């Protein structure tokens, strides 16, 4: 259905975003080498094209909606997504925004001013290169399209619940992206209102986030925070669902703590809205207010810790089978524990006053968001891809892609925790002379990681040629070897095509109209 | 007996309306960003008109699916009801964004340009001449449709048409009165940090209400072709009342500027 | 939950063998718990292996206890009692077989 | 019917042709 | 002090502010590193020492009381990690002590300063606009992109307040050698009270982006004693 | 109980111990290097004016 | 019915004031 | 096609998707 | 000090109106010279000579 | 609302007053053996369900 | 990894700071 083009546009935009990574880091190698435009002419335009194109165009559609519109109805048992007309709306809205964003890059000067476009004089003074209106419209359509898919996923896992599943033992990806869309509702239209406010300010000269008229930019600063903090929780929580499923099926289908897991995910969904706070702790709010803020970011750090202790208990005591998605899950877990550690580090009160807009926070958020989200999307593709695409994915090249990604991204984003505390500024085009050390090996690592992306492209072209002696069966047979089936059902569905080893039983590729008969749980 | 799945299907992905709405939104992008700095006055109105027309085409095909082909059932009824009842709670957030923006601009005083809010140079309207009629006309709108609903349940036609048409002819009068209020206002969009937060938290209702009048004009054209019936609960039948709850929360906006603001 | 009610309950469930994959599935799950299997359970296992007309699962239970046997001393003790049980069974060690 | 869908298809066709004619003026001034 | 190539830590602490930040930073890094040693030993032991046999253990989603034990354990980690955060915020936030006032304002490519703690013998509030040094004007001895021509000069052992605003896309001055970070908003002002420990020129840079000239905005400050600041006439 | 109970107890307790000794030698070594170097430098600048 | 009619009559009486 | 149903459209499609930041950067550096 | 607007209005609603000795207003004059900028005094003197300065007077 | 196309609203009203539901809403767990000697019975308007 | 590091070495090393002596 929508999923195949939905994934093709994600890969297109991902190679565009890695090209932006290539250009930005190739400039950041040595002082003033590759590009003469060390200014917001072309360079801050490149970092905004990079950031907003890649977060909005890659992790957001593939992680929520691709696995959503292909794998939420197939895991809950639904025929199609409950409003089949507006997935089609939202996804065809998306590449019009890709055209809108590349038009924002192309025009005369370029008002690209970072992905978090702060008002005070991003105003009509910058609109001789009026790009930033096109950038905020591309973000506005991506905003409403993710909203539309969020409503669709909520209503699909509400009314089209197949008579198997009650609300007490639900799958983790299903309940995961239900919490994700239920969390997306409560944060999207606030920033839609902020888009139309500041667009009215920079078009029809009423200027309430700007300087004149006593306009105050801190209202917008609260607004885009209040959107962008649950935005990154949208960025990670279906990733937690996918990591739960791969940690399940490659080691041990008895996983640790389901009801505890879904309670912890609802705890993250509760406590994740009301701390927009740490992102500009520094600005000079009140002391009791910022102390309450610092205290509550610790309590948003608790339940994710409970979840990763649960998966730590899960991989323990199970027959691990080190395929490529199990390597993705174990690398996910190791790097995300350290990223949440540095989260607690930045989460303190009196340390953002030394850590804001430096490369220490940059290494931290690249660490959690890049490692977590892209390792989860890696696990999702190399996990569900022979089911949907019907072809086996040449396991040895998947192994070398994993190792090459791991060492490349690690040697990129580990030196930033050294470059940051010494006092690098953020989005610096030309850094001082005493910072030339670690950016060189960061550039080496960026070429390593884009080589691994090109290796992924050769694997994606190798998805044509039906290897049989490379990868056939996840969760190899226990003690049987003469009987042949998918070897695991911890609840006894086994109805027609749905079971407890959920949706591995459709066919390869699944039919254009599956689910004729309603499934049942034991 | 030959049976089936209760939830239904539509025309497949090569469908002109999903490409139409998307290329339309790209035309709206080019309109809003090329009239703003190169100056094409004609086609932003063309983009708004083609948006309205494609919305009515999309709506006409889905109401053809509703009644002219007869697809929806009780599960799909509860699904559309719950979806566009959670759409109310989604609208509460974009509401509360402007609500909290004005709450911050009035609770925290800007030390320049009238530290007391409303500022020195801008004077608010007295809430007793026209707005005392506005709260009561919204209260009557919210008070007579809950009897119009029992009138539609009871099966008669003249009483339901009476309550319905006095409600919505009355709110056409409300469209005219809000137009004359925010025409006769002295301070404008370009004033303070007060003007285009107050005019924003009235123009949102202006946008919602012209969309509301379009939606109920098409609802009445649907009513006059014997489409809707008191047993015809198809799914559009229940999505017509919740804008009264939206007007109750509009009254909740309305109260924060009169009793607590000045 | 304890040792003895486990032994009784799953020997009662275990004399419901009647088949190849049924006895192999109940061998799998009754072997995969968090306790070492009783010698009476493995005597019923070998007798059910005689009932279901299959020899290599009667080899497979022995390498399964060779992994799970948690030391070498209990392994030699099981080799003794299971050795004269083999003399009344006829099943070989893998270490006696060399595939 | 479709007798109004044909001129609507026409005005949509020009409404998605002419902004693509607008964008070289947007890049070239 | 100054950044250095291949640097592990940050610059030298000359404030009780940076002494407290370094102390609390080593505290939180200590708790972070016991948690990292934990999870590294866990993942190595599980993945390597569990080669396996093809059975997985039976026990399904459970473990109530020992699981809630290791959910109560992060809470005591938070309390012990957050009490020094509370005492250091209480020690750092207050500004009541009498202090010299120097005020800054920055317009997209520079800063300028004003000395009005003490109406001097001339009685005039002074100004100087701290611009940059471009490629042609390079003193080859001094270091590039931290080159501010007209330095701040501040007496040692003196409480100093930075009561700043800005315009013209706004941004923030941050000197990581002494640890300052404020808003410099167009309409709102804020202070930060800080003495200094030693003498010596201290270097900083601009945190928040302003746009086409976010690169070329260096920020420095010189630290002298009381009589050398007393001799600093023609301010 | 059995082997998996013995292994979770020994494993988590030795993980506590190894993380504790890694961060304890780290904090002792580097934090005492800080107290030596910085308190000696402040001793020079204060006791020698 | 009584919530609609008499309250709407009082509404039309209060509307004629201003 | 006769030579490219999807044999080169993957390579060429990704070449375009990698090369459009290059031509955007080129026309923005030319200004 | 806190709410610099109150300090400025305190010694600006001095000798213009409310004829007072120059020393208690001079205390707040010295308070405004520190702690509060000097470039914007041209702006909030233009606001006063225009007559739509935000002070109550 | 009778005599309209697609009488799926018939058996909601019909099954509402007589019991037999419309679109086989009901679940199943017959507390069985799962054994090939007596498997769970399969009823369909087809040979595969 | 060798092809990545070698490609990095043979793409660009040109036009940096003034001189090592200037740093001194
Ligand atoms: C999906 C991405 C993602 C995720 C999940 C997080 C999660 C967290 N982030 Fe981060 N963060 C970002 C992405 C993310 N962040 C981005 C993009 C920015 C700003 C950049 C900008 O926008 O430009 C940012 C900014 C940011 C700041 C702003 C500082 C500044 O601007 O300089 C801070 C400070 O508090 C912070 C902290 C945290 C914390 C505490 C968590 C916590 O949720 C993590 C908690 C997890 C655990 C703690 C790990 C598991 C537990 C243990 C291993 C065992 C027990 C240990 C403890 C509980 C003590 N984040
Ligand atoms: C989506 C998240 C994401 C990812 C993956 C990356 C990946 C990379 N980023 Fe970026 N980056 C951001 C999001 C991301 N970044 C954000 C928000 C900013 C801040 C912007 C600013 O504030 O202006 C930023 C900023 C940023 C900076 C500026 C620092 C600043 O001042 O803050 C630099 C500097 O060179 C940089 C480099 C890189 C590099 C070399 C990679 C490399 O890791 C790239 C190599 C990785 C890949 C190979 C992944 C390929 C992925 C796919 C194609 C799809 C997914 C999976 C497949 C199916 C293959 N990034
Ligand atoms: Cu401001 Cu740089
Ligand atoms: Cu955050």
UniProtKB/TrEMBL annotation, chain B:
It comes from the Eukaryota. Component of the cytochrome c oxidase, the last enzyme in the mitochondrial electron transport chain which drives oxidative phosphorylation. The respiratory chain contains 3 multisubunit complexes succinate dehydrogenase (complex II, CII), ubiquinol-cytochrome c oxidoreductase (cytochrome b-c1 complex, complex III, CIII) and cytochrome c oxidase (complex IV, CIV), that cooperate to transfer electrons derived from NADH and succinate to molecular oxygen, creating an electrochemical gradient over the inner membrane that drives transmembrane transport and the ATP synthase. Keywords: Membrane, Mitochondrion, Mitochondrion inner membrane, Oxidoreductase, Translocase, Transmembrane, Transmembrane helix. The chain crosses the membrane at residues 14-37, 43-59, 80-103, 130-148, 160-181, 193-218, 239-260. One of its GO terms (biological process) is mitochondrial electron transport, cytochrome c to oxygen. This is Cytochrome c oxidase subunit 3. InterPro entries: Cyt_c/ubiquinol_Oxase_su3 (IPR024791), Cyt_c_oxase_su3_dom (IPR033945), Cyt_c_oxidase-like_su3 (IPR000298), Cyt_c_oxidase_su3-like_sf (IPR035973), Cyt_c_oxidase_su3_a-hlx (IPR013833). Residues 3-262 form the Heme-copper oxidase subunit III family profile domain. Belongs to the cytochrome c oxidase subunit 3 family. It is found in: Mitochondrion inner membrane. Pfam families: COX3. One of its GO terms (molecular function) is oxidoreductase activity. One of its GO terms (cellular component) is respiratory chain complex IV. It catalyses: 4 Fe(II)-[cytochrome c] + O2 + 8 H(+)(in) = 4 Fe(III)-[cytochrome c] + 2 H2O + 4 H(+)(out). It comes from Saccharomyces cerevisiae. Its main location: mitochondrion. It is a multi-pass membrane protein.
UniProtKB/TrEMBL annotation, chain E:
It is a multi-pass membrane protein. InterPro entries: CcO_II, CcO_II-like_C, CcO_II_C, Copper_CuA, Cupredoxin, Cyt_c_oxidase_su2, Cyt_c_oxidase_su2_TM_dom, Cyt_c_oxidase_su2_TM_sf. It catalyses: 4 Fe(II)-[cytochrome c] + O2 + 8 H(+)(in) = 4 Fe(III)-[cytochrome c] + 2 H2O + 4 H(+)(out). Keywords: Copper, Electron transport, Membrane, Metal-binding, Mitochondrion, Mitochondrion inner membrane, Oxidoreductase, Respiratory chain, Translocase, Transmembrane, Transmembrane helix, Transport. Its cofactor is Cu cation. One of its GO terms (cellular component) is mitochondrial inner membrane. Residues 97-235 form the Cytochrome oxidase subunit II copper A binding domain. It is found in: Mitochondrion inner membrane. Component of the cytochrome c oxidase, the last enzyme in the mitochondrial electron transport chain which drives oxidative phosphorylation. The respiratory chain contains 3 multisubunit complexes succinate dehydrogenase (complex II, CII), ubiquinol-cytochrome c oxidoreductase (cytochrome b-c1 complex, complex III, CIII) and cytochrome c oxidase (complex IV, CIV), that cooperate to transfer electrons derived from NADH and succinate to molecular oxygen, creating an electrochemical gradient over the inner membrane that drives transmembrane transport and the ATP synthase. PANTHER family: CYTOCHROME C OXIDASE SUBUNIT 2, CYTOCHROME C OXIDASE, SUBUNIT II. Belongs to the cytochrome c oxidase subunit 2 family. This is Cytochrome c oxidase subunit 2. It comes from Saccharomyces cerevisiae. The gene is cox2.
């Amino acid at each position: 259905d929508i999923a195949v083009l939905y994934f093709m546009l994600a890969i297109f935009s991902g190679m565009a975003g890695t090209a932006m990574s290539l250009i930005i880091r190739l400039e950041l190698a040595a002082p003033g080498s590759q590009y003469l435009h060390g200014n917001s002419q072309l360079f801050n335009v490149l970092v905004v094209g990079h950031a907003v194109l890649m977060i909005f165009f890659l992790v957001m559609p593939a992680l929520i909606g691709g696995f959503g519109n292909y794998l939420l109805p197939l895991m809950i048992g639904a025929t199609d997504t409950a409003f089949p007309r507006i997935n089609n709306i939202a996804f065809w809205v998306l590449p019009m925004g890709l055209v809108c964003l590349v038009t924002s890059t192309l025009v005369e000067s370029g008002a690209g001013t970072g992905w978090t476009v702060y008002p005070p004089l991003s105003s009509i003074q910058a609109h001789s290169g009026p790009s930033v209106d096109l950038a905020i419209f591309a973000l506005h359509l991506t905003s409403i399209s993710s909203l539309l898919g969020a409503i669709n996923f909520i209503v699909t896992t509400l009314n089209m619940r197949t008579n198997g599943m009650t609300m007490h033992k639900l799958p983790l990806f299903v309940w995961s992206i239900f919490i994700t869309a239920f969390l997306l509702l409560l944060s999207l239209p606030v920033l839609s209102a902020g888009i139309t406010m500041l667009l009215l300010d920079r078009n029809f000269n009423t200027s309430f986030f700007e300087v004149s008229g006593g306009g105050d930019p801190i209202l917008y600063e609260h607004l885009f925070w209040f959107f962008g903090h649950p935005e990154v929780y949208i960025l990670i929580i279906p990733g937690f669902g996918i990591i739960s499923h791969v940690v399940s099926t490659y080691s041990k289908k008895p996983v640790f703590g389901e009801i505890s897991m879904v309670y912890a995910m609802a705890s993250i969904g509760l406590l994740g809205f009301l701390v927009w706070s740490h992102h500009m702790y520094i600005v000079g709010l009140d002391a009791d207010t910022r102390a309450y803020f610092t205290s509550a970011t610790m309590i948003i750090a608790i339940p994710t810790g409970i979840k990763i202790f649960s998966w730590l208990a899960t991989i323990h005591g199970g027959s691990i089978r080190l395929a490529t998605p199990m390597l993705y899950a174990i690398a996910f877990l190791f790097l995300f524990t350290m990223g949440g550690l540095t989260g607690v580090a930045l989460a303190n009160a009196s340390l953002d006053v030394a850590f804001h807009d430096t490369y220490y926070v940059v290494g931290h958020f690249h660490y959690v968001l890049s490692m977590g989200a892209i390792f989860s999307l890696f696990a999702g593709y190399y996990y569900w891809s022979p089911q949907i695409l019907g072809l086996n994915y040449n396991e040895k090249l998947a192994q070398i892609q994993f190792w090459l990604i791991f060492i490349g991204a690690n040697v990129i984003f580990f030196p930033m925790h050294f470059l940051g505390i010494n006092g690098m500024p953020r989005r610096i085009p030309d850094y001082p002379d005493a910072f030339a050390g670690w950016n060189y090996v960061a550039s080496i690592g960026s070429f390593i990681a884009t080589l691994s992306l090109f290796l992924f492209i050769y694997i994606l072209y190798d998805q044509l040629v039906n290897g049989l002696n490379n990868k056939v069966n996840n969760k190899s047979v226990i003690y049987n070897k003469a009987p042949d089936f998918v070897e695991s059902n911890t609840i006894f569905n086994l109805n027609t095509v749905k079971s407890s080893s959920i949706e591995f039983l459709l066919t390869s590729p699944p039919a254009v109209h599956s689910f004729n008969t309603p499934a049942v749980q034991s | 007996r030959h049976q089936q799945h209760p939830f239904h299907m539509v025309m497949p992905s090569p469908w002109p309306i999903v490409v139409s709405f998307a290329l339309l939104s790209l035309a709206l992008s080019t309109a809003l960003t090329m009239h703003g700095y190169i100056g094409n006055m004609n086609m932003v109105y063309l983009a708004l008109f083609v948006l309205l027309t494609s919305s009515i085409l999309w709506f006409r095909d889905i109401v053809a699916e509703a009644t002219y082909l007869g697809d929806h059932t009780m599960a799909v009824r509860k699904g559309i009801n719950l979806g566009f009842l959670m759409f109310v709670l989604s609208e509460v957030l974009i509401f509360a964004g402007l609500f909290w923006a004005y709450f911050h601009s009035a609770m925290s005083p800007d030390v320049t340009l009238g530290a007391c809010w409303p500022p020195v140079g801008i004077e608010a309207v007295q809430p007793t001449e026209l707005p005392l009629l506005n709260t009561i006309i919204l209260l009557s709108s919210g008070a007579t449709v809950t009897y119009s609903h029992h009138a539609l349940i009871a099966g008669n036609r003249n009483k339901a048409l009476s309550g319905l048409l006095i409600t919505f002819w009355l709110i056409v009068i409300f469209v005219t009165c809000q137009y004359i209020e925010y025409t006769n206002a002295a301070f404008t969009i370009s004033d303070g940090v007060y003007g285009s937060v107050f005019y924003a938290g009235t123009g949102l209702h202006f946008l919602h209400m012209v969309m509301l009048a379009a939606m109920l004009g098409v609802n009445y054209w649907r009513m006059r072709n014997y489409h809707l019936t008191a047993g015809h609960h198809v799914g559009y039948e229940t999505t017509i009342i919740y804008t009264h709850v939206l007007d109750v929360i509009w009254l909740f906006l309305y109260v924060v500027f009169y009793w607590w603001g000045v | 939950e304890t040792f003895e009610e486990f032994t009784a309950r799953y020997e009662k469930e275990f004399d419901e063998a009647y088949d190849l994959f049924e006895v192999q599935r109940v061998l799998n799950n009754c072997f995969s718990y968090d306790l070492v299997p009783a010698p009476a359970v493995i005597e019923k296992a070998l007798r059910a292996a005689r009932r279901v007309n299959d020899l290599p699962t009667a080899i497979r239970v022995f390498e399964a206890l060779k992994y799970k046997v948690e030391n070498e001393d209990q392994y030699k003790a099981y080799l003794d009692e299971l050795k004269d049980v083999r003399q009344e069974l006829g099943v070989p060690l893998k270490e006696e077989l060399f595939p | 019917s479709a007798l109004y869908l044909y001129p609507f298809y026409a005005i949509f066709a020009v409404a998605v042709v002419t902004p693509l004619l607008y964008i070289p003026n947007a890049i070239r001034g | 002090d100054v950044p250095t190539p291949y640097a592990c830590y940050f610059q030298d602490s000359a404030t009780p502010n940076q002494e407290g930040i370094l102390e609390l930073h080593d505290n939180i890094m200590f708790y972070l590193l016991v948690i990292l040693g934990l999870v590294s030993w866990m993942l190595y032991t599980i993945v390597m020492t569990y080669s396996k046999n093809p059975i997985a253990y039976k026990y399904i989603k459970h473990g109530q009381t020992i699981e809630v034990i290791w959910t109560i354990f992060p809470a005591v980690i938070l309390l012990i990690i957050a009490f020094p955060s509370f005492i250091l915020l209480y020690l750092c936030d207050e500004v009541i002590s009498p202090a010299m006032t120097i005020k800054a304002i920055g317009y997209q490519w520079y800063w300028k300063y004003e000395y009005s703690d003490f109406i001097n013998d001339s009685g005039e509030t002074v100004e100087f606009e701290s611009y940059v040094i471009p490629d042609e004007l390079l003193e080859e001895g001094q270091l590039r992109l931290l080159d501010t021509d007209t330095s701040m000069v501040v007496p040692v052992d003196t409480h100093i307040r930075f009561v700043v605003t800005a315009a013209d896309v706004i941004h923030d001055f941050a000197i990581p050698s002494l640890g300052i970070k404020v808003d410099a908003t167009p309409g709102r002002l804020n202070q930060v009270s800080a003495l200094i420990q030693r003498e010596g020129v201290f270097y900083g840079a601009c945190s928040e982006l302003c746009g086409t000239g976010h690169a070329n905005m260096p920020i420095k400050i010189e630290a002298v004693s009381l009589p050398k600041f007393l001799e600093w006439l023609n301010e | 109980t059995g082997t998996i109970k013995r292994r979770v107890i020994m494993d988590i307790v030795l993980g506590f111990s190894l993380g504790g000794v890694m961060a304890s030698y780290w904090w002792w070594g580097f934090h005492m290097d800080k107290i030596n170097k910085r308190e000696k430098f402040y001793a020079e600048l204060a006791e020698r004016k | 019915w009584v919530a609609l009619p008499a309250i709407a009559l009082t509404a039309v009486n209060t509307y004629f004031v201003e | 096609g006769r030579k490219t149903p999807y044999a080169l459209s993957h390579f060429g499609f990704f070449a375009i998707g990698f090369a459009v930041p290059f031509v955007a950067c080129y026309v923005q550096l030319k200004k | 000090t806190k709410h610099c607007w109150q300090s400025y209005v305190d010694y600006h609603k001095c000798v213009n109106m409310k004829g007072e000795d120059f020393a208690p207003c001079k205390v707040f004059w010295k308070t405004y010279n520190a702690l509060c900028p000097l470039d914007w005094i041209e702006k909030w003197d233009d606001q006063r000579e225009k007559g739509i300065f935000a002070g109550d007077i | 609302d009778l005599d309209q196309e697609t009488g799926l609203a018939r058996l909601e009203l019909l099954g509402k007053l007589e019991g037999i539901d419309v679109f086989d809403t009901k679940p199943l767990d017959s507390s069985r053996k799962g054994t090939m000697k007596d498997p769970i019975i399969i009823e369909s308007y087809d040979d595969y369900r | 990894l060798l092809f990545s590091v070698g490609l990095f070495a043979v793409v660009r090393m040109a036009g940096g700071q003034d001189a090592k002596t200037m740093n001194k």
